[PDB]
């Protein structure tokens, strides 16, 4: 790239969200991926097969650019897995009761959730993330028979096992 | 409520010599001499500082609206010292879209001639106050420099040409044309 349009091994990152099935209403990536040897249809329909098999509620999408290959990985976001930790999917078309249903209890699954938060939190050793991502709730609202209002205060697990 | 006393001291530097004729201060340093009466302001100007170090103004048994007059004399004097030690230098830049504003001075200053403002035929002439030396600058494209010692004489001459270049019957939000004061500075910086 630097002086005169020299590619050299292309490995460039671009991120995207809002995954339906894929898209394809004469619309994909472009303004980034037309220039760069990527397509608008083939590299789009291949984004399906990897961002599929139960990915159909809004996702985050990193696509790694090799020469004309688009590596479509699904990097999990903090509140997208908690939407995926839901009572599993009613997808679209009836679901009609929109998105604030909310009782899924995620007891040790937030534990797994704050485990797979890769490098993002610059973290105290889970004594606080168990409350960071536990206070980012509008749907679930707690372990089987509680509220997240009273987990902020305590927490009696995981502190000395995560370091 | 009348306040019993308020005052303020001016720190006169070593270049200058201030000597007051009762209430009219006269200030002479390197560049020249300045003078300003204050026989409207009814204060006590003392020259307490020795060898020459303090112009101290009192007011005296005065109320709210005159105690304010204490510092405004104080500042009118430092501006006099800052004008006779360094000298004021107001810079103004010409701004336009299409028709280039065409400035040319005509005696030494004393006549700033402006052609082609907004394309207008009528050539605008602007006198300067006495002692103000207007001059077309260099090291910049569209830029005048107004120099001198009296802040009062220099900055109203600046306004005299800033107010001469005004548009009529237009949206001056769009037509941003004219010569505007861009930088109130000094001649020597020290």
């Amino acid at each position: 790239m630097p002086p005169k349009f020299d590619p050299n091994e292309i490995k460039v990152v671009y991120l995207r969200c809002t995954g339906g099935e894929v898209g394809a209403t004469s619309a994909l990536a472009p303004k980034i991926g037309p220039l760069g040897l990527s397509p608008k249809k083939v590299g789009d329909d291949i984004a399906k097969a990897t961002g599929d098999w139960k990915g159909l509620r809004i996702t985050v999408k990193l696509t790694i650019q090799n020469r004309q290959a688009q590596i479509e990985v699904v990097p999990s976001a903090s509140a997208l897995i908690i939407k995926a930790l839901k009572e599993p999917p009613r997808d679209r078309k009836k679901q009609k009761n929109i998105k604030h249903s909310g009782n899924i209890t995620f007891d040790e699954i937030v534990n797994i959730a704050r485990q797979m938060r890769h490098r993002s939190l610059a973290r105290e050793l889970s004594g606080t993330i168990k409350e960071i991502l536990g206070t980012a709730q509008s749907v679930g609202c707690n372990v089987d028979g509680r509220h997240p209002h009273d987990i902020i205060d305590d927490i009696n697990s995981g502190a000395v096992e995560c370091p | 409520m009348k306040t019993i006393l308020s005052n303020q001291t001016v720190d006169i530097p070593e270049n200058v010599d201030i000597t007051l004729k009762g209430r009219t201060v006269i200030v002479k340093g390197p560049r020249g001499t300045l003078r300003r009466d204050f026989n409207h302001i009814n204060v006590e100007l003392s020259l307490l500082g020795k060898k020459k170090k303090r112009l101290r103004v009192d007011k005296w048994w005065g109320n709210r609206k005159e105690l304010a007059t204490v510092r405004t004399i104080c500042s009118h004097v430092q501006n006099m010292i800052k004008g006779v030690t360094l000298g004021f230098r107001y810079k103004m830049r010409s701004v336009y879209a299409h028709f280039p504003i065409n400035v040319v001075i005509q005696e030494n200053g004393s006549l700033v001639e402006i052609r082609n403002f907004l394309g207008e035929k009528y050539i605008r002439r602007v006198r300067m106050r006495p002692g103000v030396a207007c001059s077309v600058s260099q090291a910049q494209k569209d830029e005048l420099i107004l120099e001198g010692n009296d802040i009062e004489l220099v900055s109203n001459s600046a306004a005299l040409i800033q107010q001469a270049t005004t548009v009529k019957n237009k949206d001056i939000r769009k037509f941003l044309d004219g010569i505007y004061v861009s930088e109130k500075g000094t001649v020597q910086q020290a």
Partner: protein
């Protein structure tokens, strides 16, 4: 056409200004009261409309 810093100079003299809702007089941007005796130093102030 007109250089940026030069533009936002003249803007400083023609554009960023408060205006009396009472008597339409033009004031500087720090104004909380008006100048005029005719309106009565109103404080019903509002910015000058920025040209679109």
């Amino acid at each position: 056409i007109i250089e940026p810093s030069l533009r936002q100079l003249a803007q400083k003299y023609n554009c960023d200004k408060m205006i009396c809702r009472k008597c339409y007089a033009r004031l500087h941007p720090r104004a909380v009261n008006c100048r005029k005796k005719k309106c009565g130093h109103t404080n019903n102030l509002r910015p000058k409309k920025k040209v679109k």
